[PDB]
Amino acid sequence: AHKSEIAHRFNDVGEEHFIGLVLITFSQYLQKCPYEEHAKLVKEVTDLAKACVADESAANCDKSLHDIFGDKICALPSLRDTYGDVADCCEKKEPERNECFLHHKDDKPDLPPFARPEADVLCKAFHDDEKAFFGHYLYEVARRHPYFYAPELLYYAQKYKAILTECCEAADKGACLTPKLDALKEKALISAAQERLRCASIQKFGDRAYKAWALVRLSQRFPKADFTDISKIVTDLTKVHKECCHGDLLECADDRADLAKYMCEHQETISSHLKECCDKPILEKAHCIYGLHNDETPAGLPAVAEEFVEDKDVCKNYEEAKDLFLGKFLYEYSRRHPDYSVVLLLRLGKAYEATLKKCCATDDPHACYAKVLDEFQPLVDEPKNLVKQNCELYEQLGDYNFQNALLVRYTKKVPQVSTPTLVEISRSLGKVGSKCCKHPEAERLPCVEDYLSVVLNRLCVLHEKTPVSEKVTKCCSESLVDRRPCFSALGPDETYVPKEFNAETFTFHADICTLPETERKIKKQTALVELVKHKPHATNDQLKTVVGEFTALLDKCCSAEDKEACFAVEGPKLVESSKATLG
């Protein structure tokens, strides 16, 4: 506690961010309330802050940020809690009142997807009022991604603003703007996932999990750093994400900026590469540190087996100080290994731990553990080959079929997962190919596995509240590190009773012709999940034949003049066709 937290935070981060952070905080709790309630609490909360800044003894100035946040939300029944799904929470005081709000964060609130207006419509909306425009935007992203790394979101606001400035006075708005914007959106969709996994890891496996994973990553990134300095960054980063993940976004943003200050302050003993982040303005600085390229591995690194197979004191260290020593290991194997994905290193360190567990209980531990590292080869080998195989098949099929290949895979693995979920995940899984195979072989594993780790996690967190498949609970619950293996290991389900031919899941309306080719794809891809759900022993060619025909229903019927009639004309004949081609 400061004497007035809200003031400290307000002076620390500044008005514009502070408004930013508070908008996001609110957007994130009450994701279902319309923009105007939000702006209301935001300004209400900014007013109180400016007030406190002014004189620290004003009323409410001593309350915790939660208390302030809470109170304001309960003159939000003043704007009818018609939903009010969590008016329950307002009933209790803290900390329950707050804990309660976090329970209700929803990872897929029932909202029309964030819609892209026409290049021109964006451009004007942006010309008219920057404030409102990016308010709405912060509002809209934050509420679909209730765990989105807040500070980065502000960053994305600042980038989206640069792109808008760029494109909104080109002779053609759209062509300047839509690629640059898709690009960035795909990137935000990744960051949202990354952060989601950090939170998931924190909340469901505990601080140690984010710690461990963090140490590994930074060890690869900052190979030259002593283990002391990597630990401090890890502990600071833990705090920031614990905070960010828990809605304490202001403290999180302060703590974050504090941490980047520290690294910049200490770049010499951390990394050469830091220079190019540390000159930058506040958010590009933290952004830049955040996805910085790995430094090169220091020269003169002793073999890893001196310290870990050969010290007489191997068991003495694992026994007397297990965290200290195993972090050391994750630090040392990791800094020596930018070519691995974090989760691979995590697994390795995990095998390294069981081996010592098993071997230090012997009369001869060394003789037991001596091969420990060589025995890593298999674990290094399993994903190595997998990637080569999958990128083979990516190269072969191309994005759309690579996604289809996975939809069909996945829907067979875990058919009880709801369709749009399966459609979503398989598209993202698909995305890995396009994302990583392009890199040269050695660069790929990290790219792939850690990307997969984010996507699989999206699957888990989607699957969590509305849990339907033992197979996914198991893989999601059992080990964070071994998730991907586990999902890869899944073959066809042997329990699922196949779905019935629902006339409508292959039915339509003129409206779907309003959907860009992209949305149209998801529609066929939903058709295809449905179809494997109907007949799972259906051949690829069979499946390809119906999806191909479904593709041909659209291609005729969204013709110049009348679209409505055809659907009703071929539609049922297109149903009939499909049942025919399958059996």
Ligand X SMILES: COc1ccc2cc([C@H](C)C(=O)O)ccc2c1
547 binds ligand X (CB under 6 A): yes
The phi and psi torsions of 243 (rounded to 5 degrees) equal -70, -50
DSSP state of 498: P
User: Among the candidate windows 125-133, 269-277, 479-487, 567-575, which touches ligand X by CB under 6 A?
Assistant: 479-487
Q: Is 246 annotated as a binding residue?
A: yes
422 binds ligand X (CB under 6 A): no
Residue 92: strand, helix, or coil: coil
User: Among the candidate windows 6-14, 164-172, 249-257, 399-407, which touches ligand X by CB under 6 A?
Assistant: 399-407
Q: Is 5 annotated as a binding residue?
A: yes
**Packed helices 65-74 and 15-29: angle between N→C axes, nearest 10 degrees:** 60
Q: Is 251 annotated as a binding residue?
A: yes
- Asked whether the CA dihedral 195, 198, 199, 204 is positive or negative, the reply is positive
Which residue among 212, 244, 417, 462 contacts ligand X (CB under 6 A)?
Answer: 212
Residues binding ligand X: what is the number (CB under 6 A)?
A: 38
User: Among the candidate windows 93-101, 347-355, 371-379, 462-470, which touches ligand X by CB under 6 A?
Assistant: 347-355
Half-sphere exposure of residue 101: CA atoms within 13 angstroms, side-chain side:
29
Which residue among 353, 375, 399, 493 contacts ligand X (CB under 6 A)?
Answer: 353
Q: Is 555 annotated as a binding residue?
A: no
Cα-based distances in Å from 164 to 137, 200, 265, 428, 512: 13, 33, 34, 27, 29
Min dist CB 367 to ligand X, Å, is: 23
**Packed helices 15-29 and 130-142: angle between N→C axes, nearest 10 degrees:** 40
User: Among the candidate windows 106-114, 193-201, 308-316, 343-351, which touches ligand X by CB under 6 A?
Assistant: 343-351
Token digits of residue 289 = 């540190």
230 binds ligand X (CB under 6 A): no
**Interacting residues of 187 by C-beta distance below 8 A, sequence separation 6+:** none
Question: Are 205 and 155 contacting, i.e. CB atoms less than 8 angstroms apart?
Answer: no
Min dist CB 356 to ligand X, Å, is: 10
Min dist CB 95 to ligand X, Å, is: 26
Q: Is 504 annotated as a binding residue?
A: no
Token digits of residue 152 = 């980065």
- Residues of span 264-323 touching ligand X by CB under 6 A: 323
404 binds ligand X (CB under 6 A): yes
Amino acid making up residue 406: L
Residue entry with tokens 């002779």? 171
Q: Is 535 annotated as a binding residue?
A: no
Residue entry with tokens 């030259």? 224
- In the complex with ligand X, the residue whose CB is nearer, 103 or 388, is 388
CA distance 66 to 1: 13
Which residue among 2, 43, 127, 208 contacts ligand X (CB under 6 A)?
Answer: 208
452 binds ligand X (CB under 6 A): yes
- In the complex with ligand X, the residue whose CB is nearer, 484 or 563, is 484
Which residue among 193, 405, 422, 461 contacts ligand X (CB under 6 A)?
Answer: 405
- In the complex with ligand X, the residue whose CB is nearer, 142 or 460, is 460
CA distance 549 to 564: 18
Residue entry with tokens 């779907």? 512
CA distance 182 to 365: 55
Footprint on this chain of ligand X (rule: CB under 6 A): 208, 211-212, 215, 234, 323, 326-327, 330, 346, 349-350, 353, 386-387, 390-391, 397, 401, 404-406, 408, 429, 432-433, 436, 448, 452, 481, 484, 487-488, 528, 540, 543-544, 547
- Binding site per annotation, positions for Zn(2+): 66, 246, 248
